[PDB]
Paper text:
The hook, a highly flexible universal joint that connects the filament to the motor, consists of about 120 copies of a single protein, FlgE23. We examined the structures of large inserts in the FlgE sequence by solving the structures of FlgE from Caulobacter crescentus (C. crescentus) and C. jejuni. We solved the structures of both FlgEcc32 and FlgEcj79 to resolutions of 1.84 Å and 2.45 Å, respectively, using X-ray crystallography. Both FlgEcc32 and FlgEcj79 contain completely different extra domains that are not present in FlgE from Salmonella enterica.
C. jejuni FlgE2, hereafter termed FlgEcj, with 865 amino acid residues, is one of the longest bacterial flagellar hook proteins. We crystallized a 79 kDa fragment of FlgEcj. This fragment, called FlgEcj79, lacked the N-terminal 90 residues and the C-terminal 37 residues. In the case of the structure of the hook protein of C. jejuni, the Cα backbone trace of FlgEcj79 shows four domains, D1, D2, D3, and D4, based on the distribution of hydrophobic amino acids. D1, D2, and D3 are each made from two discontinuous segments. Domain D4 is made from one continuous polypeptide segment. Domain D1 consists of the N-terminus Val94-Ala168 and the C-terminus Thr744-Thr819. Domain D2 consists entirely of β-strands organized like a rugby ball. The core of domain D3, which consists of segments Ile440-Ser448, Asn496-Val518 and Gln533-Gln617, has a set of eight β-strands separated into two groups by two α-helices. Altogether, these β-strands and α-helices form an α-helix/β-strand barrel (αβ-barrel) that makes an angle of about 80° with domain D2.
Residue numbers in the entry: 94 to 819
The structure:
């Protein structure tokens, strides 16, 4: 019942030629395929050409013919398109995936036993799980693109970072073991003197940049107590983070920094410098008067038994490494001389600072695997092989410093944490690096569940020959317990902001990790991810689903972002038969501009081989948008979501007769069993110059005259016409 108030006169015909006109629209399909009216007149229009599925309205109008039992063969996909958003912002909810797992060996896949760069975006490695799952592994990710378990962006910025303490910083003064002065020992003494009730000593030291001075020290407990006023900061004065306690005989001090307090350099580790004008706890000559029962004190001496000359020799009793009495103990000493310096720096904590710029932490020999250690010509010569040279540097003290550790990716940070736990901590508080400080079985990895994980297996290790300077044979090194303290990084000027979200990730490391089977893990790390299943059809019209996943790898502040695009097909189908990597998996990229528009994506086409009977090498075009536009893939600050997908392929199908209808454009719409809807025919609409000059012949039929003018045939919706209802 196709009617038209607007626009005039359908054409109608019986046999060839001889057309007629009617505004009556009571139309149906017969059992023989002809579109007719009740009078059996076949409506005139244009038929679809199935060879190109086009309707040519330019051709001469003829009988509209629609085979009722018409079968349309399946058509294979030549193109698939997607409309979707990839969240570029800081809230991704559950549209995420875990951080990729990482080896304990930098630049090396331990399972394949090959050299692979974890930070290279050109390299992508898969592994097969126990549940027969093919996952990406061994991939370092820009730390700027990290999320927590909640889907909240850590929003890490260049210059931000954290402190990681691996153990407590400790130092004991007076390691030379000179006894403390004893007022109850009624004889001359040359000892460590901390003052009496009647004699004061001068405390003069610099501790973590803070000068600690007191000339009113009358006991070691006074010194300890005064020093500990500097442990915590005041609103006007820095703290040291260093607590002091007197040793067993009260001859010296035991310092400890757990590095759990503060966010600045001055609150971490122990850097002690003693002034040469310090007298507190130094060497004094105590002379006894038997008559008066009193003591007198001097710290200079005269070069005579009981009052020997005291030569500090540019050192302090606190920090000296050697002490020498002259003459030898069989005779009373007339001179005592110290050897060493005035400072001691104990390092157990390091700062890890993020850089959005490229970072190469470099290769280093690792017993865990990879390249072998390659020594130089001798045990006193640095290696030329890069990883070996860096290993040489490490085991000779090259990491025991306060240098900034710069990282960009998760692999960078992982390996840096591992290297510092192994060679960057003064475990015995000596102020120097030795093989005793080597904790080489510490391993830092990232699990498949996205956690940083640290192990401390109770196993000895080996340092190869010619690695430690002057040591030409192998060295067995022992494991050490570790105690973690994690804080945010800042400066005293307050010009670097702290990142609580990022710091909280690694504060999960906090606590002791004793040698054994225990494992310290970080909080879970996530990535912005979005997956979609794109439907296609093979030559036989079977439906296949392209598994497409986008994971954001990096972002720039006003330069857009970049995603890894992974396409999977279930076996035995193939999309990567001739390329490297698995044959059912394609690895590509999708890059976006700062406005969220598509910049580029690759690949643009795939070569599909279903291997189910259908034809192979089915080239399928990927239509994910054009560069610079928002028509396909976009990455903007809103939830990752699929708007729609489409393909030009379809399975085989048949025409359902009773589902026929007509649009306002005169198109006869045929619905099929395959879900497709085609315009199988377009109804011709024709008008005349005059409408008042026409004759009623049949039932609402009109024939042309000389008064009407000849018939001009056109298409509804063009000119000033159109059709209605169904």
């Amino acid at each position: 019942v196709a009617i038209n108030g607007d626009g005039f006169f359908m054409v109608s015909d019986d046999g060839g030629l001889t057309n007629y006109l009617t505004r009556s629209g009571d139309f149906k399909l017969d059992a023989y395929g002809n579109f007719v009216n009740n009078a059996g007149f076949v409506v005139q229009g244009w038929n679809i050409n199935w060879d190109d599925q086009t309707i040519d309205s330019s051709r001469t109008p003829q009988n509209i013919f629609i085979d009722p039992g018409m079968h349309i063969p399946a058509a294979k996909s030549t193109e698939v398109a997607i409309k979707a958003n990839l969240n570029s912002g800081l809230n991704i909810g559950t549209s995420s995936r875990n951080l990729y797992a990482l080896d304990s060996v930098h630049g090396w896949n331990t399972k394949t036993q090959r050299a692979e760069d974890e930070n290279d975006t050109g390299t992508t490695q898969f592994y097969t799980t126990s549940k027969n799952s093919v996952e990406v592994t061994e991939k370092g990710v820009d730390a700027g693109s990290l999320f927590n378990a909640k889907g909240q962006g850590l929003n890490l910025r260049d210059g931000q970072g954290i402190w990681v303490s691996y153990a407590d910083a400790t130092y004991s003064t007076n390691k030379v073991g000179v006894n403390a002065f004893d007022p109850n020992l009624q004889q001359n003494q040359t000892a460590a003197f901390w003052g009496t009730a009647n004699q004061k000593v001068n405390l003069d030291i610099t501790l973590n940049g803070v000068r600690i001075q007191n000339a009113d020290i009358q006991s070691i407990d006074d010194a300890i107590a005064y020093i500990n006023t500097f442990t915590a900061p005041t609103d006007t004065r820095d703290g040291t983070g260093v607590k002091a306690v007197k040793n067993k005989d009260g001859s010296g001090i035991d310092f400890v920094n757990d590095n759990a307090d503060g966010t600045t350099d001055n609150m971490k580790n122990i850097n002690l410098v003693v002034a040469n004008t310090n007298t507190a706890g130094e060497l004094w000559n105590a002379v006894w008067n038997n008559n008066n029962q009193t003591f007198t004190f001097n710290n200079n001496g005269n070069g005579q038994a009981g009052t020997p000359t005291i030569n500090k020799n540019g050192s302090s009793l606190w920090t000296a490494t050697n002490i020498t009495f002259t003459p030898q103990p069989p005779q009373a000493a007339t001179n005592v001389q110290l050897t060493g310096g005035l400072n001691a720096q104990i390092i157990t904590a390091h700062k890890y600072i993020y850089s959005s710029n490229p970072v190469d932490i470099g290769p280093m020999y690792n017993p865990d695997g990879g390249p072998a250690f390659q020594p130089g010509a001798n045990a006193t010569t640095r290696p030329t092989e890069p990883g070996s040279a860096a290993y040489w540097d490490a085991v000779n003290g090259g990491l025991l410093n306060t240098n900034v550790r710069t990282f960009r990716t998760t692999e960078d940070l992982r390996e840096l944490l591992q290297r510092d736990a192994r060679y960057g901590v003064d475990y015995d508080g000596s102020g120097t690096f030795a093989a005793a400080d080597i904790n080489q079985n510490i391993k830092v990895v990232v699990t498949a569940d996205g956690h940083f994980a640290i192990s401390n297996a109770n196993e000895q290790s080996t340092v190869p020959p010619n690695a430690i300077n002057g040591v030409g044979n192998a060295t067995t090194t022992d494991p050490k317990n570790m105690s973690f303290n994690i804080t945010a990084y800042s400066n005293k000027q307050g010009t670097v902001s702290t990142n609580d979200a990022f710091t909280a990730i690694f504060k999960a490391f906090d606590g002791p990790l004793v040698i054994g089977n225990q494992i310290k893990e970080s909080e879970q790390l996530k990535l912005s991810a979005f997956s979609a299943g794109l439907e296609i059809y093979d030559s036989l019209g079977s439906k296949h689903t392209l598994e497409v996943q986008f994971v954001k790898q990096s972002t720039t502040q006003d330069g857009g972002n970049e995603w890894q695009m992974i396409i999977r097909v279930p076996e035995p189908a193939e999309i990567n038969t001739t390329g490297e990597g698995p044959n059912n998996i394609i690895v590509g990229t999708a890059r976006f501009n700062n406005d969220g528009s598509l910049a580029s994506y690759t690949p643009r086409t795939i070569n599909f081989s279903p291997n189910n009977g259908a034809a192979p090498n089915q080239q399928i075009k990927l239509s994910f948008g054009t560069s610079g536009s928002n028509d396909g893939l976009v990455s903007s600050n809103s939830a990752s979501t699929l708007t729609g997908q489409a393909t030009d392929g379809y399975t085989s199908g048949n025409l359902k007769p009773d589902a026929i209808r007509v649009d306002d454009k005169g198109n006869i719409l045929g619905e099929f069993t395959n879900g497709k809807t085609f315009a199988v025919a377009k109804i011709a609409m024709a008008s005349v110059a005059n409408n008042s000059g026409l004759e009623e012949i049949g039932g609402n039929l009109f024939k042309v005259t000389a008064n009407s003018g000849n018939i001009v045939v056109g298409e509804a919706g063009t000119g000033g016409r159109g059709e209605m209802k169904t």
